[PDB]
Design a protein around this ligand. Structure first.
Ligand SMILES: CC(C)(C)c1nc(-c2cccc(NS(=O)(=O)c3c(F)cccc3F)c2F)c(-c2ccnc(N)n2)s1
Ligand SMILES: CC(C)(C)c1nc(-c2cccc(NS(=O)(=O)c3c(F)cccc3F)c2F)c(-c2ccnc(N)n2)s1
Lengths: 249, 247
């Protein structure tokens, strides 16, 4: 019932980087772990409060497609311990490296399962990117890094605009990455152009870029997820149903 | 709370019965395993909460992920679904050929889970090769917490402690390196019970394969000590496997 890991048990190691919040290092604790710490000399009451809140949210997650929360510590720095994922993110595999359709579908399915699970718990991700989707042992999708993210931002977010619908839009962009192998808006290299245009309602991902073997049901689902108006986007129960179905059919 | 309301879980094919309860494959935000408990009484409900209370305390990659419990239509526990088969099936049925590196990683992962369980002061009471699920063939998943006498420590046969878990892990180590179950040339349950229980019989270490690192042979022998207090603790066990893993 209590997930406080007494300090001195955790052997922190090499730094990996910084996500939406905190900084992560590879660690040692009953095996490999990832350790996200807030490196400040002394946490301001704001930081201590937010720390308690997010931990309270993370301890409500138990699903194979959600990064495993394992525990937390408060001294000397506030820290959150998670499982260690082997391999790289979906971003690296898609954009920084040299997948067959069946794998692409399965990745989409696992991600939908995780998101569907989160939404049923009334949890909004707020920062879903292919960057946040770790392919553990290249076989299991692990969603992490909750709240450069401009590409995955819904039009209303670009202009509290966060909701289940904005998560769905981000998921739609991830589908676009899986089915095209590309990041959206390749012919636009200006950050403010995309911000203006996507926000203006003018610009949307180019669905003609999808692969030939990409199923039409997937293509339709993608277009539904990418609706400019938020209340026109599908919910994850319907999203999961469609993917899981088409994976068979 | 981790109670899953009635109707959210779709039960599929029966998988089998374990140390307690009956397992089915199911649907709930993806694939799950549903362990049906055959039943509630006021007191049965308390015992149900106590076991769920223990399971709710585990958050580790090498421990089967608890996901929730059902009170209606009947008492049930929900866990993740593992793809593939048990370590037992690979070693003794499938005859899957593992390079020494895989066998030691599996041993290392199992050690990680057991060390975690013991740090939480949880005793498994029924660790064996078919309790160890190789999820997607790579990740060890220890489940089925407490007919299976091959993994029973002498003191258990004649009781349950961290030391008896260590012994059971020693037999698993034996399986990994030998490829066989202990006492293969003796197909008599009563005999093994009598002889292992009184201390006259122990696993034949001559049957370990040549490629097996000698440090693991020693560690295996240390785990299989007939006298309970001469067995090493899992933190020590993990380190030596971890140290040997460098190669
Ligand atoms: C590169 C980048 C983006 C900085 C990373 N952050 C994490 C990481 C490490 C710890 C937590 C969270 N995400 S979180 O903080 O939102 C979170 C929890 F703290 C607990 C449970 C789920 C969860 F998403 C992370 F994304 C990474 C991470 C986590 C596990 N294994 C590996 N190999 N990397 S990589
Ligand atoms: C009948 C047999 C072959 C022994 C099995 N039992 C389980 C199974 C199913 C559910 C729970 C537990 N073990 S448990 O009941 O002790 C337990 C929890 F309920 C929660 C967390 C850990 C844990 F070990 C299991 F072993 C199996 C199982 C579990 C997950 N995936 C698959 N494919 N099979 S297989």
């Amino acid at each position: 019932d209590d997930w406080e890991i007494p300090d001195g048990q955790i052997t922190v190691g090499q730094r990996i980087g910084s996500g939406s919040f905190g900084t992560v290092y590879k660690g040692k604790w009953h095996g490999d772990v990832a350790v996200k710490m807030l490196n400040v000399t002394a946490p301001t009451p704001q930081q201590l409060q937010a720390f308690k809140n997010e931990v309270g949210v993370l301890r409500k997650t138990r699903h194979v497609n959600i990064l495993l929360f394992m525990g937390y510590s408060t001294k000397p720095q506030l820290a959150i311990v998670t499982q260690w994922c082997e391999g790289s993110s979906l971003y690296h595999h898609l954009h920084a490296s040299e997948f067959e359709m069946k794998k692409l579908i399965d990745i989409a399915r696992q991600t939908a399962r995780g998101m569907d699970y989160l939404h049923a718990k009334s949890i909004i991700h707020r920062d879903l990117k292919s960057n946040n989707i770790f392919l553990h042992e290249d076989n299991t999708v692990k969603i992490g890094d909750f709240g450069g993210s401009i590409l995955w931002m819904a039009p209303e977010v670009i202009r509290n605009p966060y909701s289940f619908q904005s998560d769905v839009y981000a998921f739609g962009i991830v589908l676009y990455e899986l089915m095209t192998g590309q990041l959206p808006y390749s012919n636009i290299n200006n950050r403010d152009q995309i911000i203006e245009m996507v926000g203006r309602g003018s610009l949307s991902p180019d669905l003609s870029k999808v692969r030939s073997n990409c199923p039409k049901r997937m293509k339709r689902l993608m277009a539904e997820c990418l609706k400019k108006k938020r209340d026109e986007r599908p919910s994850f129960p319907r999203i999961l149903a469609e993917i899981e179905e088409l994976a068979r059919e």
